Structures are given as C-alpha cells and as structure tokens.
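DM between two lab members

TW: hey, do you still have the peptidyl-prolyl cis-trans isomerase 5 entry open?
JB: yeah, one sec
JB: this one, 182 aa:
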Amino acid sequence: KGPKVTDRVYFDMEIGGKPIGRIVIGLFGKTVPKTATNFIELAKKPKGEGYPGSKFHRVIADFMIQGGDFTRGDGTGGRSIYGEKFADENFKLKHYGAGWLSMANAGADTNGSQFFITTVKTPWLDGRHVVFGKILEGMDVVRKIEQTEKLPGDRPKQDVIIAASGHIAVDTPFSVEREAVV
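TW: and the structure you got?
JB:
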C-alpha cells in the first residue's frame, strides 16, 4: 500500500576526504514526479551545477541531515531545474520516521535544490515540507554523518561531501512501507 519507488539515486559520501560509504535513495516518481525529477536531474549534474561536490552543511543529531546547497554551501543558496524556486507539489507523504527524504524550504512554495534526510520521525514538518523519497541502503552512512563532530551553528567540523552522485534506473516500481528506515 506504500508509495512506489520509481527511481534510485546514489550519493558516495566522504567526510574530510575520508570515504564513508554509499547512500541509496528511492524516489516516489508517481507520487511527486516534479519534485522527484528535480532531485534526479541535480544528482546527474556535474560539480558546481548539481549535487556532486556539494556538502551536508547542516547536521543535527536526533533530527536530520541537510544538504543540496550547491551554490553557497551554507543554506542560503541552491536552485532547481525549473528556475530558482518551485511550488510545493503536494503533501501526500509524511515524515514517517528516520530515513525519509524531504525538501528544505523557506516557507510555502520555495523549493530549490536543498533537501534533508530525517534521522527521527518529524511530525511537526508534515504538510510543510514535500516528502519525496526513502533511504533504501546506507542508513548507516546517514548515521555516520548524523554523529560527525560539529561546530556551533549545526555545521560539520569536517566537510561532509557528496563526492559522487547519479541515478540508477528502476526495473519495476515497488511499494515501500510508510515506516522508519532501519
């Protein structure tokens, strides 16, 4: 009964130049096609133009990890394939638990490139941030990032970099449970 994964995206992660493993995300291309498409294309862009080379600039343990600011690296930048900003596509899905993918924003209809991966269930974000994927593999890599040493301002002391990213196609869309990722 769960939403269908139609596409995969991978992130090969490094912290301060040390490889820490791959995150694999399933995207709900039937539920939020426009949001999913943005993410997939930004994952396919080259550095400075998309996710490769960008960092998780905001990390809050017992909450979420946030990245996708490929133009300013600090939360103030980023842009979508549709222009600087695009509208909230729908709020069909909730932040069911750790390991859900949702768009960062600065209020209604301000989606860019920035996104976060939850590390706990975050009901207060439901209806405010568009949820569009679920972690499929590499939740331990997420947790590694979640626990990385921080500076004040919720910033990793060492850069947490998406060294590489890309899109793996999907056979046959499959349903996933609306539950925390183990």
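TW: got it. The first strand starts at residue 4 and ends at 15. Residues 66 and 139 are 14 Å apart (CA to CA).
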